Design a protein around this motif. Sequence first.
Motif: not given
Length: 255
Positions: A93-122
């Motif tokens: 299970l992966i626990f990414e940092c959240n709003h209760a954490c003392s760290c910054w929004r750009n910390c290393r443990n945040r990926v899924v919460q940053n949304g889509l980064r790939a060029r996808l196509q239907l």
Amino acid sequence: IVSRDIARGYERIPIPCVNAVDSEPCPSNYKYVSQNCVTSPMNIDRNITHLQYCVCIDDCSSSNCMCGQLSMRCWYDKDGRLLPEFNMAEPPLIFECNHACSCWRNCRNRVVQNGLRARLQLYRTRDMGWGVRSLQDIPPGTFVCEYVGELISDSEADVREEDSYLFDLDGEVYCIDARFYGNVSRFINHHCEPNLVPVRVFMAHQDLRFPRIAFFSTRLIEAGEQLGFDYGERFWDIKGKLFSCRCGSPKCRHS
Ligand SMILES: COc1cc2c(NC3CCN(CCCCCN)CC3)nc(NCCCN(C)C)nc2cc1OCCCCCN
Ligand SMILES: [Zn+2]
Ligand SMILES: [Zn+2]
Ligand SMILES: [Zn+2]
Ligand SMILES: [Zn+2]
């Protein structure tokens, strides 16, 4: 190009819909949503005092990060990709940092919460159906997209005719039904040797009954390559009696 963006601008980058096979319009018999939704009450635990968090004073790249510990260890590298050590066969299970954490929004443990980064196509496939593909190369362990849909109870999913878009979040189980409400993931076809693997992730809340499903690439995915993931035993034990898998893999386990 039948649609400029099936997400209507809700994703970080458009997800165009093309058809080079026939003249069928882009699918429109469903509502596109970028985040999970519910069609009833749903008592998800969003009590902020219930969140476990970290007090890191750096970018959460040290062994002290509480969130990394909950994840066994932080599996993201500087680029936001899963480390080689990550177990794709049985993902933790992966626990990414959240709003209760003392760290910054750009910390290393945040990926899924940053949304889509790939060029996808239907896109319209050969079998007259629809699939999703990357328009760029995607390194291994890269977050591709989340499986979004209608969050429902097990008993609720049990009285639904069309069950081809369900995804079990296996006491008391819940599912995500992408039939009526869903995102781009509702179009990803099954594959016996998947380039995508689902990982249970927790961000804003840590209610274990409601993990969010994130698809990470299991290897390099080349531009133009179709995306796919393993639907699993339940799907095939039910649909296997209606058709055979056509993922066309030398190791196809359902045909
Ligand atoms: C299509 O493959 C799936 C079917 C599922 C299903 N189907 C039932 C079959 C009987 N109908 C009964 C219909 C009654 C109609 C009455 N008018 C209701 C839906 N039910 C549940 N969960 C609830 C099971 C019951 N619990 C008590 C254990 N999960 C499912 C997960 C599936 O794989 C998903 C794999 C990923 C695929 C991604 N697209
Ligand atoms: Zn931290
Ligand atoms: Zn952090
Ligand atoms: Zn944290
Ligand atoms: Zn197959």
